[PDB]
Each structure stands twice: as structure tokens, then as C-alpha cells.
Amino acid sequence: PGAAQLAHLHGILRRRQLYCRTGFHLQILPDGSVQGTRQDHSLFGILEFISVAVGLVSIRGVDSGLYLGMNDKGELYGSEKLTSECIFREQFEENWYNTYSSNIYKHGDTGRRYFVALNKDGTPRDGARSKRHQKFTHFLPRPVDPERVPELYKDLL
Amino acid sequence: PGAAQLAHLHGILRRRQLYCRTGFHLQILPDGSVQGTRQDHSLFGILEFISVAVGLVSIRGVDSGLYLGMNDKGELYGSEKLTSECIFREQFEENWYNTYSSNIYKHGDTGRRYFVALNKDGTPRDGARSKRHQKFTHFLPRPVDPERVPELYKDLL
Numbered sequence: 001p002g003a004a005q006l007a008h009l010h011g012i013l014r015r016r017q018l019y020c021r022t023g024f025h026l027q028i029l030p031d032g033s034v035q036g037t038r039q040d041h042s043l044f045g046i047l048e049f050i051s052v053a054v055g056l057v058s059i060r061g062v063d064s065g066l067y068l069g070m071n072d073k074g075e076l077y078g079s080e081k082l083t084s085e086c087i088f089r090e091q092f093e094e095n096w097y098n099t100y101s102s103n104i105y106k107h108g109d110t111g112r113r114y115f116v117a118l119n120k121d122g123t124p125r126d127g128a129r130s131k132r133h134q135k136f137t138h139f140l141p142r143p144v145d146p147e148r149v150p151e152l153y154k155d156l157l
Numbered sequence: 158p159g160a161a162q163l164a165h166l167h168g169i170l171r172r173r174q175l176y177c178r179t180g181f182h183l184q185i186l187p188d189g190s191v192q193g194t195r196q197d198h199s200l201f202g203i204l205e206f207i208s209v210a211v212g213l214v215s216i217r218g219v220d221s222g223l224y225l226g227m228n229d230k231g232e233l234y235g236s237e238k239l240t241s242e243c244i245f246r247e248q249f250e251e252n253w254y255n256t257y258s259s260n261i262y263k264h265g266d267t268g269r270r271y272f273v274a275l276n277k278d279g280t281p282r283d284g285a286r287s288k289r290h291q292k293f294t295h296f297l298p299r300p301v302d303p304e305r306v307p308e309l310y311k312d313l314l
Contacts, residue, residue: 006313006314009313010303010304012170013169013170013301013303013310014302014303016300019253051302051304096176096297096299140253141299141300142253142298142299142300143171143173143298143299143300143301144170144300145171145208146167146170146171147167147208153170156163156166157163
């Protein structure tokens with residue numbers, strides 16, 4: 001084909017599963033909420049990673065179509081349109097587990113950044129109360145076996 | 158396009174990096190040898206996973222073009238053509254780390270299978286001397302960021 005064809009396929013090559021070290025895969029539901037499923041290959045767990053810049057990413061739910069974004073008060077959510085709240089800093093942490101902080105939100109005084117995180121029960125943790133050294137913020141990007149989520153792969157088809 | 162087009166692309170969607178728990182990415186060199194690099198996104202570290210059957214896989218080096226295979230005496234190597242020695246049993250182990258044993262080789266007496274493994278210094282370990290509970294055999298499948306290995310992605314292009 002052509003035009004936007006090249007970039008579009010690569011997005012599909014960049015689809016991942018974000019497994020949080022507390023035992024959950026980050027998912028972005030259609031209603032706009034963000035949470036964690038213990039299920040491998042969840043349909044909303046299939047996230048497409050857009051490499052914005054060096055150390056920067058944007059995570060779009062392939063199924064929900066929404067972009068992961070963190071707001072003013074540290075709360076995660078699914079943004080229907082890209083915004084400055086949707087760009088996160090991707091930093092290595094330990095063992096291929098990355099950490100993802102807001103690219104615009106931090107604690108004015110300490111300078112400590114706000115982090116994308118999930119509690120041990122799976123619900124979204126308050127970005128501001130989450131820290132780099134805590135396991136709530138560790139996220140291992142995982143590969144997506146397309147044959148396990150066919151609905152999401154009828155673009156090439 | 159057509160004919161074999163559908164299956165071909167999916168192979169590209171199933172390219173992975175096999176990170177061994179002892180600190181290395183399994184690579185398949187052109188000379189036919191198998192070893193481990195500490196380098197993320199090594200050019201020979203980019204393996205295409207062929208899901209043979211349930212719990213079965215075949216690993217082909219994208220760059221070397223060779224298929225990972227284990228022989229009679231537990232030694233890994235890069236097979237130029239598929240053989241019975243190239244099919245491995247993929248089993249979950251802990252934390253998304255899988256274990257890969259020979260689908261035809263085991264210890265006649267104990268019944269303990271032969272495992273794909275790398276020592277802590279990175280060289281290939283003897284399949285027969287490797288065990289499931291040992292970290293030499295733990296392998297975390299990782300995603301491949303195409304933009305980091307362009308040479309290997311000129312098929313779609």
C-alpha cells in the first residue's frame with residue numbers, strides 16, 4: 001500500500017504487554033479506567049508502545065483505543081486523545097523491568113517524580129505515592145503472541 | 158500479496174529475544190555456534206519463535222537463518238535445516254521465565270529431560286547437566302524493538 005502504511009505496521013510490531021512486578025498486566029478499559037489483570041494475554045492488556053523520543057513513550061490500548069495518561073493528582077486513566085499527560089519517561093530499573101513516570105508531574109519540593117503503578121491487589125496506585133525503588137512501579141514489557149488475540153490482528157488481515 | 162504472505166509476516170510478529178536468567182541473551186551465530194551476549198538487541202540475539210504445537214517451539218536465528226537445535230550429547234548448535242533435534246518443549250517456570258528441553262532427549266533412567274541452558278559466563282551449558290530448577294535454564298522471552306535492528310526488518314520494507 002502506501003502513505004501511512006509503513007508507520008502503521010511498525011505500531012503493530014511495537015505492541016506489548018506491560019507486566020507489573022506486583023503480579024498484574026496493566027490494562028486500559030474502554031470506560032477509560034486503568035487497572036490490572038492477572039490474566040496473560042488479556043484483550044485490553046495488549047498495549048501498543050509508541051516511542052515518542054529518547055526515554056519517552058506513549059502507551060495506547062490496542063483494544064480500547066485510548067492512550068494511557070496520568071493526571072494532576074497522580075491518577076491513571078485512558079485518554080481518548082493524546083495530551084501532555086500521556087507522555088511518560090521510560091527508565092530501566094533492574095532485570096528488564098522499566099519504570100514509567102509522568103513527563104510533566106513531580107513533587108515541587110523533593111523533585112521526586114510521579115510514577116505509573118499498581119498495588120498488590122491489582123488496582124491503580126496513586127502516582128504521587130509511588131516511588132522508583134518500590135515494586136509497585138516496576139513494569140516488564142512483554143511480547144504479544146498474536147495467535148492468542150486474533151480479534152486485535154485483522155489489520156494485516 | 159499472497160500464498161505464503163500471511164504466515165511470513167506472523168513470523169516477524171513472533172520474533173523475540175531469549176534472555177537467560179544468568180545474565181545473557183541467547184544468540185545463534187552464522188558459524189553455527191550458540192552462546193550468550195550481555196548485549197541487549199544483539200543482531201544474532203533476535204530469534205523468531207515458531208509455535209510448532211502446544212508447548213512446542215522451534216527457534217530460528219533471524220540473522221544467522223539457523224534453527225536452534227540440541228544434539229545427542231546435550232550440546233546446542235545452529236541447524237541449517239529443521240530436524241527432530243530442533244523441537245523444544247516450552248514450559249512456564251516462574252515469573253514469565255520459561256524452560257526449554259529437548260523434545261527427544263532425556264536420561265533413560267531418571268527420565269529427567271535435557272535442557273537448553275547457558276552458564277554464568279555466557280557459554281552454552283551441557284544440556285544433560287542442566288536442570289529445570291537451576292537458573293541456567295530459565296529463559297524470559299523478550300520483545301524486539303525493530304528500530305534497534307533495522308537490517309533485520311527490510312522484509313515489510
